[PDB]
Amino acid sequence: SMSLQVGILGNTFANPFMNAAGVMCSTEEELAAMTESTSGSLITKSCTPALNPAPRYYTLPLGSINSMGPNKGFDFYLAYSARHHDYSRKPLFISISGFSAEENAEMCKRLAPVAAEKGVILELNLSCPNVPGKPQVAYDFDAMRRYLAAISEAYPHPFGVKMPPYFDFAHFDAAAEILNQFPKVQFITCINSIGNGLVIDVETESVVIKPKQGFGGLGGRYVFPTALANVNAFYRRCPGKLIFGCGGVYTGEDAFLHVLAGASMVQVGTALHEEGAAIFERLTAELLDVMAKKGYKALDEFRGKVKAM
Amino acid sequence: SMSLQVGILGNTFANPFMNAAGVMCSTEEELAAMTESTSGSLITKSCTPALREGNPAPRYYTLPLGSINSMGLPNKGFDFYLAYSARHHDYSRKPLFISISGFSAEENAEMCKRLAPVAAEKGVILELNLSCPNVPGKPQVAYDFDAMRRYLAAISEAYPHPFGVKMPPYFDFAHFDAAAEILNQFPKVQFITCINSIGNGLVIDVETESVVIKPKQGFGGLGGRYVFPTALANVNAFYRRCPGKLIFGCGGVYTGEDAFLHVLAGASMVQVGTALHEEGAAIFERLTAELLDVMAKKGYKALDEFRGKVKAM
Ligand SMILES: Cc1cc2nc3c(=O)[nH]c(=O)nc-3n(C[C@H](O)[C@H](O)[C@H](O)COP(=O)(O)O)c2cc1C
Ligand SMILES: Cc1cc2nc3c(=O)[nH]c(=O)nc-3n(C[C@H](O)[C@H](O)[C@H](O)COP(=O)(O)O)c2cc1C
Known part of the structure; x- marks a missing residue:
């Protein structure tokens, strides 16, 4: 009948x-x-x-606005990948964000055998x-180019x-031109x-977060049109790569637009922080409802098919 | 005994x-x-x-x-807005800004050369x-x-x-930091409007599964509530780094409280785009009343008492 499945990176995501x-x-x-939720996948904290x-x-x-900065260290998340995550349940992504090309490269050399043995996937x-x-x-x-070359050599x-x-x-154009020179970059997540x-x-006439004089990163409804633009722009300019959509998703209709724009996977931040892991039961149901009303049976039928006018 | 007046650029704004x-x-x-509305000022379409039909x-x-727009600078042409500044605008009602948006530094500098005598006689103020x-x-x-440095040098020579x-x-x-360092090198740049x-x-x-505007494959500039935190950040970032310039706030203003936050972040004037498109010029009566109500509840008597005074917890 209908399916939300996504077959990418050698995995079938539910x-x-x-x-x-x-x-x-x-x-x-x-x-x-x-891992226990109905989400198709999950990703770790940038370590x-x-x-x-x-x-x-x-x-x-x-x-939302955030100035988080905080992680239990690479060894913890690498360990969670090594022999603590239930891969028969769903695939796992690990996010890393070292402060230099060298730190990132070192972390990747370590990750390489875990990725090969267990299937965990790197998001840089x-x-x-x-x-x-x-x-x-x-x-x-x-x-950018120096990080990508360093990681490509080490990973x-x-x-x-x-x-x-x-x-x-x-x-x-400049970003896609750089990414298209690195064949090992298989997906792009838009946006932070x-x-x-x-x-x-x-x-109080005060900023609401303490670090950096109140300046922080915005998420949620504020970023949705910007996130769709970036998904679509890179979808168009990097046809050899997958696009993951992130930003502004609260409903299955929001997820539908991300996919229409080009997204293969759809990440949920602010709305998940507020709702907890049960949101995924609601999002899949809402996505399926939109598809049913339009007669779509699979995501491949409309991914990236936004009509220009 | 409270006042919303702004004394800047040699004018009193109501x-x-x-x-x-x-x-x-x-x-x-x-x-x-x-001009007939209660706004303290107005600015022309970028010309x-x-x-241009746009x-x-x-x-x-x-x-x-x-809102999202891709207007593409439809406008009546510089000669039209120049003539409005020189001959139709009622300066006894309020000051006037003219916005110019040539496609090259030389286009902009030629327009400024013609604007200069009108600015000297009538007092219209240029926004680039x-x-x-x-x-x-x-x-x-x-x-x-x-x-940016080239445009500013060109206009500084011409105007x-x-x-x-x-x-x-x-x-x-x-x-x-890069933008403020450039701006601080041009003494004639006296105000900075954040943001477009x-x-x-x-x-x-x-x-319909399709984009909602036609040009540029549906891509366009966002205004309204989407941009408010970004606009406040840019106002405060330049307020801090360009102490010799005035900052004008633009972005996300729908209420007097939104305007209060702009001023708190450092804005001298507060521009209203999307909200004014939707409500029309009566919005200014509501915004002034709402801003006065925020200040009444806090004991403020003038904008100078809190402009730029955001507290960094
Ligand atoms: C509290 C918080 C922490 C975040 N931490 C990270 C992070 O460690 N690494 C990262 O790449 N993005 C991080 N993000 C950004 C999200 O991954 C996402 O890009 C952003 O929130 C936009 O999605 P949203 O509109 O659904 O919230 C964080 C966001 C929030 C709100
Ligand atoms: C329909 C429309 C036309 C605009 N035309 C111009 C323009 O000609 N020149 C300019 O500098 N900004 C122009 N803008 C940007 C606005 O001046 C303003 O910076 C932006 O809308 C954010 O303010 P807002 O949130 O109050 O709408 C335009 C915005 C809209 C929506």
Whole structure:
């Protein structure tokens, strides 16, 4: 009849839904909750080789702002991949975001045998937007290329990159031109949060998060049109790669638009932070309802088929 | 005993509010309606040396939380807005800004040369648009710092008066610092408007499975509530890094509280785009009353008492 299945990266995902990196994925107990949910997959917290002040998160009327910075260290998440994750349940992604090309490369050499033995999939975070002193790596195309070449030399398996939003076609073209030179980059996740927004509270006349003078990354309804644009822009310019959509998903109708724009998988951040892992039962049901009303039987029938006018 | 007055640029503004460039300001009838409204000021549509019809329609679309547009600088031509500044605008009612958006530094400098005598006699104030995010082929000038420096040097040579610049949003501190370092080298840049729309978003209709505006494959500039936290961040980022310039806030203003936050972040004037497109010029009566109500509840008597005073917890 109808299916939400996604056959990519040598895996059959039950549906396109997973958590966004950093949400519900830092403790063993959250990973278990994610693994136990009806999501098609899950991803770990972006980790650093070794293990920001609070409040570092804040629920907004239209979404969220965050200045998280915090992880249990690479060894923990590599261990969770090694012999703690139930792969018969769903595939697993691990997010890494070392502070240099060398840290990332070192971490990948370590991951290589786990990935080969267990099937865990690397997502390299080039876009993280609260790193004090270090702007988004992918906003500096010379640094982008150096990271991607370093990882490609150190890592034998395919991997993905999590990208910041871009806001004009020259940057979309330049980024896609670089990514298209690295065959091991098999997927691109669009988008990380929109960086360095600022939220102020009317009553207290104060910023709502402590680090970085209140500047933090935006998620949720604020970022949805930007996320769709980036998904579609890279879908069009990187036809040899998969696009994962991330940003602004609250309903199956939101997920439908991400897929229409080009998304293979659909990550859920702010809405999952608010709803918990039961959201995935609602999203799959809502996605299927939209498809039923349109007569679609599989995602491959409309992925990327947004009609221009 | 409370006041919304703003004393900047040699004028007294009755209040901080004005239209955002491009909204309700393209024809004489719209400019007259802005002048008759209670806004403290107004600004013309960004103009080119010649008249332009702009991008094919539909090119504007109302979103749940704001708007998307790819207008493409439809405008009556510089000569029209110059004549409005010189001969029709009632300066006893309120000050006037003229926005210009030539396609090259030389286009902009020729327009400024003709504007200069009108600015000297009548007092119209120039806003240079470096951020227009829908001109097919031409990317946001202020996203290329070499072009930005070139445009500013060209206008500084051509134009004798202080002027302002309308800026695209930035999203990291390296870019905030690069832009502010350039701006601080041009003494004639006296105000900075943050922000123009967030460029090249994309909206798709679920029912039709197609983009909602025609140009550029449906990609267009976002306005309205989507952009509010980004707009506040840009206002405060430049407020901090350009202490010798005024900051004008633009983006996401639908209420007097939204305007209060802009001023708290450092805005001297507050521009209103999407919300004004939807409500019309009566919005300014509501915004002033709402802003006065926020200040009454806090004991503020003037905007100088809290402008820029956001507390970093
Ligand atoms: C609290 C929080 C923590 C996050 N941590 C990470 C992270 O560690 N690595 C990463 O690549 N993205 C991180 N993100 C960004 C999300 O993965 C996602 O890109 C963003 O929130 C937009 O999705 P949304 O609109 O569904 O929230 C984080 C987001 C939030 C709100
Ligand atoms: C229909 C429309 C036309 C616009 N035209 C211009 C323009 O000609 N020049 C300019 O600098 N900005 C233009 N803008 C951008 C607005 O001035 C403003 O920066 C943006 O809409 C964000 O403000 P808002 O959230 O209040 O809408 C236009 C915006 C819209 C929606």
